[PDB]
Amino acid sequence: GMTIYTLSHGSLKLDVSDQGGVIEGFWRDTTPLLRPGKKSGVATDASCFPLVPFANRVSGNRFVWQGREYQLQPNVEWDAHYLHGDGWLGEWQCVSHSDDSLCLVYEHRSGVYHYRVSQAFHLTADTLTVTLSVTNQGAETLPFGTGWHPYFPLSPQTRIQAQASGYWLEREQWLAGEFCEQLPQELDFNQPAPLPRQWVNNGFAGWNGQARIEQPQEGYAIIMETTPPAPCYFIFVSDPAFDKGYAFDFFCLEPMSHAPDDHHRPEGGDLIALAPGESTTSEMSLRVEWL
Secondary structure, rough: OEEEEEEEEEOEEEEEEOOOOOOEEEOOOOOHOOOOOOOOOOHHHHHHEEEEOOOOOOOOOOOEEOOEEEEEOOOOOOOOOOEEHHHOOEEEEEEOOOOOOEEEEEEOOOOEEEEEEEEEEOOOEEEEEEEEEEEEOOOOOOEOOOEEEEEOOOOOEEEEEOOEEEEEOOHHHEEEEEEOHHHHHOOOOOOOOOOOOOOOOOOOEEOOOEEEEEEHOOOOOOOOEEOOOOOOEEEOOOOOOOOOOOOOOEEEEEEEEEOHHHHHHHHHHHOOEEEOOOEEEEEEEEEEOHH
């Protein structure tokens, strides 16, 4: 059944569910740093979910790797494309839980990718560190990636800053389209900027793995750092036309270890080739600071 694990240190508190390995809350005192989760067991209602064994979609639900054609099947009812891997949809097991740390594991043995993944969480007085480590357990080498999909509170006063040298236009089926090196002003977060008040679903390239989310109305900022530095991020802002219960109360800034559709680029782009038994690890940290 569903389990929620709580960690705390000082004024920071984190709730994590075994359903999807999702964060269900992250707070400083009563102030939400991530959007509070519904604890519904549906990852898209949570505060953050992990992306493994890759992030986003592979256009056409197919790809060639080392001369062999692989085909994926849709994993959620609401998207024609296989989306965000399997971790977010699976039930995880807890292997450790202490006052300020938690480790969950998930094993997948169906579909294209077979693997084991661990997700570790750690709290200090001002920082949450989350680590994903994934091991290929299949019979062939495949290209892997990791990432996360956090949901942050959104205010008219919120501003973000995240280096980018270009972006992919959104095309049909929610897919990444043409790559473009001129960022429109409204989507240019190289210097702190507001979120647009309209649908946004776009990937950005040229990132240095570091972001700043400013919440001036509450007097804090969150400093996001990834190790190894992530090269791409997605921004999501919804619209009251795709989500009738949406009032611009959250947005997502999603770090990814690879570019969308890297499965189609030479040697897999920034995807990491893992032979059977090989692993790769990424870390995201979120640090709260007085602005």
